[PDB]
Scaffold this motif. Structure first.
Motif, PDB file in Angstrom:
ATOM      1  N   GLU A   1       0.808  -1.182   0.000  1.00 50.91           N
ATOM      2  CA  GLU A   1       0.000   0.000   0.000  1.00 50.91           C
ATOM      3  C   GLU A   1       0.860   1.258   0.000  1.00 50.91           C
ATOM      4  OE1 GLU A   1      -2.024   1.096   3.634  1.00 50.91           O
ATOM      5  OE2 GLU A   1      -3.904   1.364   2.461  1.00 50.91           O
ATOM      6  N   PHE A   2       2.033   1.163   0.595  1.00 48.35           N
ATOM      7  CA  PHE A   2       2.881   2.322   0.857  1.00 48.35           C
ATOM      8  C   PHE A   2       3.722   2.647  -0.412  1.00 48.35           C
ATOM      9  CE2 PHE A   2       6.568   3.942   3.563  1.00 48.35           C
ATOM     10  CZ  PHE A   2       6.022   5.183   3.793  1.00 48.35           C
ATOM     11  N   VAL A   3       3.035   3.165  -1.412  1.00 46.45           N
ATOM     12  CA  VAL A   3       3.626   3.432  -2.684  1.00 46.45           C
ATOM     13  C   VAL A   3       4.431   4.693  -2.607  1.00 46.45           C
ATOM     14  CG1 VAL A   3       1.931   2.153  -4.002  1.00 46.45           C
ATOM     15  CG2 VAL A   3       1.511   4.564  -3.485  1.00 46.45           C
ATOM     16  N   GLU A   4       5.167   5.028  -3.671  1.00 42.39           N
ATOM     17  CA  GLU A   4       5.798   6.337  -3.773  1.00 42.39           C
ATOM     18  C   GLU A   4       4.831   7.420  -3.565  1.00 42.39           C
ATOM     19  OE1 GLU A   4       8.567   7.436  -6.895  1.00 42.39           O
ATOM     20  OE2 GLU A   4       7.843   5.706  -7.930  1.00 42.39           O
ATOM     21  N   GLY A   5       5.236   8.481  -2.902  1.00 39.33           N
ATOM     22  CA  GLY A   5       4.357   9.564  -2.714  1.00 39.33           C
ATOM     23  C   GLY A   5       4.928  10.551  -1.682  1.00 39.33           C
ATOM     24  N   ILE A   6       4.234  11.650  -1.504  1.00 33.42           N
ATOM     25  CA  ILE A   6       4.542  12.621  -0.408  1.00 33.42           C
ATOM     26  C   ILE A   6       3.551  12.326   0.729  1.00 33.42           C
ATOM     27  CG2 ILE A   6       4.785  14.963   0.264  1.00 33.42           C
ATOM     28  CD1 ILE A   6       5.411  15.815  -2.548  1.00 33.42           C
ATOM     29  N   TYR A   7       4.142  12.013   1.891  1.00 30.30           N
ATOM     30  CA  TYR A   7       3.391  11.654   3.107  1.00 30.30           C
ATOM     31  C   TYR A   7       3.564  12.734   4.155  1.00 30.30           C
ATOM     32  CZ  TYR A   7       2.745   7.139   0.900  1.00 30.30           C
ATOM     33  OH  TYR A   7       2.387   6.116   0.054  1.00 30.30           O
ATOM     34  N   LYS A   8       2.500  12.888   4.959  1.00 28.27           N
ATOM     35  CA  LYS A   8       2.530  13.764   6.112  1.00 28.27           C
ATOM     36  C   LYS A   8       2.164  13.001   7.364  1.00 28.27           C
ATOM     37  CE  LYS A   8      -0.724  16.828   5.991  1.00 28.27           C
ATOM     38  NZ  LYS A   8      -1.561  18.077   6.167  1.00 28.27           N
ATOM     39  N   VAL A   9       2.972  13.088   8.351  1.00 31.66           N
ATOM     40  CA  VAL A   9       2.721  12.490   9.670  1.00 31.66           C
ATOM     41  C   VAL A   9       2.450  13.622  10.654  1.00 31.66           C
ATOM     42  CG1 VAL A   9       3.697  11.063  11.514  1.00 31.66           C
ATOM     43  CG2 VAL A   9       4.171  10.502   9.160  1.00 31.66           C
ATOM     44  N   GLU A  10       1.223  13.643  11.198  1.00 28.56           N
ATOM     45  CA  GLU A  10       0.903  14.706  12.180  1.00 28.56           C
ATOM     46  C   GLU A  10       0.770  14.076  13.563  1.00 28.56           C
ATOM     47  OE1 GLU A  10      -2.079  17.799  11.256  1.00 28.56           O
ATOM     48  OE2 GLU A  10      -2.379  18.059  13.420  1.00 28.56           O
ATOM     49  N   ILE A  11       1.577  14.499  14.461  1.00 26.40           N
ATOM     50  CA  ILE A  11       1.617  13.936  15.839  1.00 26.40           C
ATOM     51  C   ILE A  11       0.949  14.957  16.748  1.00 26.40           C
ATOM     52  CG2 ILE A  11       3.168  13.145  17.646  1.00 26.40           C
ATOM     53  CD1 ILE A  11       5.304  12.694  15.478  1.00 26.40           C
ATOM     54  N   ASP A  12      -0.089  14.471  17.484  1.00 25.13           N
ATOM     55  CA  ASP A  12      -0.878  15.407  18.360  1.00 25.13           C
ATOM     56  C   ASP A  12      -0.130  15.634  19.704  1.00 25.13           C
ATOM     57  OD1 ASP A  12      -2.596  17.047  19.689  1.00 25.13           O
ATOM     58  OD2 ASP A  12      -4.223  15.456  19.723  1.00 25.13           O
ATOM     59  N   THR A  13       0.920  16.400  19.600  1.00 23.66           N
ATOM     60  CA  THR A  13       1.707  16.680  20.808  1.00 23.66           C
ATOM     61  C   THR A  13       0.933  17.583  21.773  1.00 23.66           C
ATOM     62  OG1 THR A  13       2.745  18.581  19.716  1.00 23.66           O
ATOM     63  CG2 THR A  13       3.847  16.506  19.452  1.00 23.66           C
ATOM     64  N   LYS A  14       0.087  18.424  21.281  1.00 20.47           N
ATOM     65  CA  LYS A  14      -0.593  19.340  22.208  1.00 20.47           C
ATOM     66  C   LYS A  14      -1.486  18.542  23.169  1.00 20.47           C
ATOM     67  CE  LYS A  14      -3.432  23.572  22.427  1.00 20.47           C
ATOM     68  NZ  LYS A  14      -4.169  24.503  21.531  1.00 20.47           N
ATOM     69  N   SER A  15      -2.249  17.583  22.722  1.00 15.56           N
ATOM     70  CA  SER A  15      -3.070  16.818  23.653  1.00 15.56           C
ATOM     71  C   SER A  15      -2.256  16.053  24.652  1.00 15.56           C
ATOM     72  CB  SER A  15      -3.989  15.909  22.886  1.00 15.56           C
ATOM     73  OG  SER A  15      -4.911  16.560  22.094  1.00 15.56           O
ATOM     74  N   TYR A  16      -1.080  15.526  24.234  1.00 18.33           N
ATOM     75  CA  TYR A  16      -0.217  14.851  25.176  1.00 18.33           C
ATOM     76  C   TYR A  16       0.183  15.766  26.289  1.00 18.33           C
ATOM     77  CZ  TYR A  16       3.888  12.521  26.961  1.00 18.33           C
ATOM     78  OH  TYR A  16       4.751  11.835  27.802  1.00 18.33           O
ATOM     79  N   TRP A  17       0.660  16.955  26.034  1.00 23.55           N
ATOM     80  CA  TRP A  17       1.052  17.867  27.110  1.00 23.55           C
ATOM     81  C   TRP A  17      -0.170  18.369  27.902  1.00 23.55           C
ATOM     82  CZ3 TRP A  17       5.600  17.266  28.481  1.00 23.55           C
ATOM     83  CH2 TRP A  17       6.646  16.988  27.527  1.00 23.55           C
ATOM     84  N   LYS A  18      -1.252  18.664  27.264  1.00 18.11           N
ATOM     85  CA  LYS A  18      -2.414  19.179  28.011  1.00 18.11           C
ATOM     86  C   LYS A  18      -2.887  18.134  29.025  1.00 18.11           C
ATOM     87  CE  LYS A  18      -3.649  23.322  26.436  1.00 18.11           C
ATOM     88  NZ  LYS A  18      -4.099  24.471  27.253  1.00 18.11           N
ATOM     89  N   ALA A  19      -2.828  16.830  28.743  1.00 18.66           N
ATOM     90  CA  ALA A  19      -3.258  15.792  29.708  1.00 18.66           C
ATOM     91  C   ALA A  19      -2.304  15.737  30.860  1.00 18.66           C
ATOM     92  CB  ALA A  19      -3.300  14.463  28.931  1.00 18.66           C
ATOM     93  N   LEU A  20      -1.103  16.266  30.777  1.00 26.86           N
ATOM     94  CA  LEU A  20      -0.130  16.396  31.897  1.00 26.86           C
ATOM     95  C   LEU A  20      -0.234  17.778  32.516  1.00 26.86           C
ATOM     96  CD1 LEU A  20       2.834  14.697  30.050  1.00 26.86           C
ATOM     97  CD2 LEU A  20       1.472  13.772  31.933  1.00 26.86           C
TER      98      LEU A  20
END
Ligand SMILES: Cc1ccc(C(=O)c2cc(O)c(O)c([N+](=O)[O-])c2)cc1
Ligand SMILES: Cc1ccc(C(=O)c2cc(O)c(O)c([N+](=O)[O-])c2)cc1
Lengths: 116, 116, 116, 116
Positions: free
Chosen positions: C54-73
């Protein structure tokens, strides 16, 4: 399992392979006693340095020979080495991963400390 | 001078000069509205993007064209760009310095936020 | 195996657990199509997002929800998220680890790209 | 102004103020000779450590007392200190800025080396 060192190359996006690592422990008389050494494998990791029972409380130093790694790639890097010094096992036994991310003029290091 | 961007090169150990930087503000429809832009100076810094009056609370995006920088140096990069998205001025006006430290396969970004 | 995301907390020296991650791929019409999502496990890692086929050539974006991680702390962090955008598999299939090291006002990210 | 040290705090998003910094030069017997010292200013910078004439070629160590900084903030640190060791002036006199970005369980250091 209690001490692992991992080294990554931020130029190529790869493990840093064959990097020499020396570990020292601070003795009661304040000298640094050799404790373990090894080199990173194909995955950039160095396992098997110590045992839970040998790895007592103490101040440890991990010296990573980053300069030889860059010089073998033809680069004259800024740093002579990357050293990490830390107190271990002060609150009971823990597992430590010491990770270093290398560039010719910068390095980062982090510790991941877990309780098994 | 409420917003300054600084870019450094961890391969050369230098400022990252002539790096294009575009700043956006999030519109009510959640699209990105063009805000300011420039290129880093010989010190790696980009000043003069906005004013106190214009830099109101909102969510801002800073896009740094890292890929063009590494291509100009003849070095293969991983990332398409480096983006920093943050909410500004939550608790009164601040001075923000957004610093990015670049390597071909890694980057770091930090905010230095001081109160005038 | 071809895409793994790993998130670490530089305050506590630990994996960043339960961090949401969304991956997108750029379509031929330049929009970002949802590709995969998940959350980090106890080790800070997120496996099983895609397959070689499935992981063909292409431009990928990975978005990591860091704000929710810190807000829960209890922390109000600087960044809204950490996004990584990259061209994948341009020279043939590779395995990608995208690692992010988080602090409230900074993050670093690196890619480790291997050829299986 | 050939050597400047700058320290930043990735938890607070600020300069790291009042951080003690000691500079050493390696002696012929491979011991570390005290060279200069100071504390970071309100901008996180330490200027005025040496002069052009005194900063000759040699291997230098910069020790940053990170543990005292985090203890003063009431935050548990991993490292005993952060040390940067580098060979100076290999290819003519430079201006060096040694920057360190601190988190409790990680730090980064970069060199910005410019030619007067
Ligand atoms: C993530 C990161 C790490 C290190 C640097 C960095 O090396 C640096 C160097 C400077 O002279 C300087 O003035 C600043 N700043 O005020 O932000 C940062 C910049 C960014
Ligand atoms: C920017 C950055 C710096 C350091 C780390 C980092 O500390 C780390 C630790 C690991 O155990 C590990 O397996 C990996 N990895 O493979 O990417 C990275 C992760 C990210």
């Amino acid at each position: 399992c209690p001490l692992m060192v991992k080294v990554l190359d931020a130029v190529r996006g790869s493990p840093a392979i064959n990097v020499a690592v020396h570990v020292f422990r601070k003795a009661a008389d304040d000298t640094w006693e050799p404790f373990a050494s090894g080199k990173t494998s194909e995955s950039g990791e160095l396992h098997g340095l110590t045992t839970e029972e040998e790895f007592v409380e103490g101040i440890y130093k991990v010296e990573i020979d980053t300069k030889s790694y860059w010089k073998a790639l033809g680069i004259s890097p800024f740093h002579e080495h990357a050293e990490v010094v830390f107190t271990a096992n002060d609150s009971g036994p823990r597992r430590y991963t010491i990770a270093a991310l290398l560039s010719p003029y910068s390095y980062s290091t982090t510790a991941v400390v877990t309780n098994p």
